[PDB]
Design an enzyme around this catalytic site. Structure first.
Site, PDB file in Angstrom:
ATOM      1  N   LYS A  61      -6.421  -4.791  -3.284  1.00 44.67           N
ATOM      2  CA  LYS A  61      -7.115  -5.506  -2.207  1.00 44.67           C
ATOM      3  C   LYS A  61      -8.203  -4.613  -1.633  1.00 44.67           C
ATOM      4  O   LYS A  61      -8.019  -3.388  -1.545  1.00 44.67           O
ATOM      5  CB  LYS A  61      -6.172  -5.970  -1.084  1.00 44.67           C
ATOM      6  CG  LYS A  61      -5.381  -4.877  -0.387  1.00 44.67           C
ATOM      7  CD  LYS A  61      -4.426  -5.506   0.626  1.00 44.67           C
ATOM      8  CE  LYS A  61      -3.603  -4.447   1.326  1.00 44.67           C
ATOM      9  NZ  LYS A  61      -4.473  -3.487   2.070  1.00 44.67           N
ATOM     10  N   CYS A  92      -2.394  -2.645   7.621  1.00 43.72           N
ATOM     11  CA  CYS A  92      -2.326  -3.561   6.482  1.00 43.72           C
ATOM     12  C   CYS A  92      -1.083  -4.449   6.528  1.00 43.72           C
ATOM     13  O   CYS A  92      -1.148  -5.636   6.184  1.00 43.72           O
ATOM     14  CB  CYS A  92      -2.375  -2.786   5.170  1.00 43.72           C
ATOM     15  SG  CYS A  92      -3.948  -1.870   5.010  1.00 43.72           S
ATOM     16  N   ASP A  95       0.813  -1.230   0.000  1.00 46.11           N
ATOM     17  CA  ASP A  95       0.000   0.000   0.000  1.00 46.11           C
ATOM     18  C   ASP A  95       0.843   1.276   0.000  1.00 46.11           C
ATOM     19  O   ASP A  95       0.552   2.231   0.723  1.00 46.11           O
ATOM     20  CB  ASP A  95      -0.970   0.013   1.187  1.00 46.11           C
ATOM     21  CG  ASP A  95      -1.944  -1.140   1.162  1.00 46.11           C
ATOM     22  OD1 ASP A  95      -2.006  -1.834   0.136  1.00 46.11           O
ATOM     23  OD2 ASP A  95      -2.658  -1.346   2.170  1.00 46.11           O
TER      24      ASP A  95
END
Lengths: 222, 222
Positions: B132, B165, B23
């Site tokens: 995701k 995450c 990310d």
């Protein structure tokens, strides 16, 4: 039921909810148990035990399903994974027994004292008691199936450790679309005090809700 | 290959391993991104981007698969779930956009600047880029299938947020029997500084291994 909580109050139907008591075993709460032998501080879990007993009484009276987890394995640790599993290398129970062969086969072993639920907490008929072989109750178990079979979408979490088995099960519950709230004064961390603080922060900020036992019990009173 | 790490060194084959960049979007690392606008501190992420570049270069030259994640949804946020999903109620991006309507459709939105990988991090041919829809890369994705299809058992984690995450994907990887190591100086937390320390403590103590970029690159150089 409307439950006051951080970061804001939430709603749940107790008859469509479960109270999960994570790993309230001598291993995790009792002097002489695994966490104590492994160097973690377990001297302050007595109020956690009493608070869980209080929360269980209220939840059962309101129609919530009570689910008890017991973490651990067969005495030969087949179920822990051998050297090909990261669990073999990470488990502080397995590490402690490798350092102390006198304890080999006792820590987190089904049928043993370490594995027993603490004396004060006794599941009742109709409760579900779930063995789990890894920290998270949502891997390698029928937990998701059991909950879905009853239409349960709301989970209230108690137990030990806040930052490991509790938080992992709550996080994975969130990925399986469950709404999870943790009762902060019915948990205890494994590690320094910042591990309790950070687990609650991560839950409140990203994964679920935080409340406490008194608020939970009063919310259930009707 | 031996990678020096906490709490002890591990061995691995870089060819059977993957470097996961979690990310590294404008939302998580760049001023004016989602995290910044949501009140989180991103003022120290420049060295993290630089450290990820260094680790990606060493990983690729060693034959490690590079996987890039992008977190987010369609611009109408159908993929974030509606009110029936806890993600709808927990996502601080969705929170922020409901608070500031000028930002609706701009945060974590496919096609948006916020959603893009930072300019400095450019996937290369052979890498895998995966979207995701939730914090953990191991739910609702083909990540496990991709790794199993290549016999990969060792995951090296970088990116943001360490405690959200990153940690969630590492924890879930452990439950899927992956050996996970995080490069601590190639991550940044979402929240106060204790959230960095506590995520690394939980990984080191229960879930995986902690190392750093210079140690990683030195380990790969033969």
């Amino acid at each position: 039921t409307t439950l006051t909580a951080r970061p804001e109050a939430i709603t749940f139907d107790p008859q469509q909810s479960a109270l999960i008591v994570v790993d309230m075993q001598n291993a995790y709460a009792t002097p002489g148990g695994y966490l104590d032998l492994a160097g973690f501080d377990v001297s302050t879990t007595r109020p956690v035990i009493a608070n869980i007993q209080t929360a269980v009484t209220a939840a059962r009276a309101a129609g919530m399903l009570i689910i008890w987890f017991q973490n651990g394995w067969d005495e030969q640790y087949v179920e822990a994974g051998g050297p090909g599993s990261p669990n073999f290398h990470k488990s502080n129970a397995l590490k402690t027994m490798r350092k102390q062969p006198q304890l080999q086969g006792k820590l987190l072993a089904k049928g043993s004292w370490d594995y027993q639920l603490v004396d004060e907490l006794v599941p009742q008929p109709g409760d579900i008691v779930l063995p789990k072989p890894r920290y998270s109750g949502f891997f390698n178990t029928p937990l998701d199936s059991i909950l879905r079979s009853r239409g349960i979408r709301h989970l209230v979490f108690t137990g030990i450790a806040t930052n490991v088995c509790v938080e992992s099960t709550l996080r994975d519950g969130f990925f399986l679309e469950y709404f999870g709230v943790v009762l902060e004064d019915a948990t205890h961390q494994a590690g320094p005090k910042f591990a309790q603080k950070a687990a609650l922060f991560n839950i409140e900020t990203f994964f679920g809700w935080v409340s406490d036992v008194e608020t939970f019990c009063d919310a259930l009173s009707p």
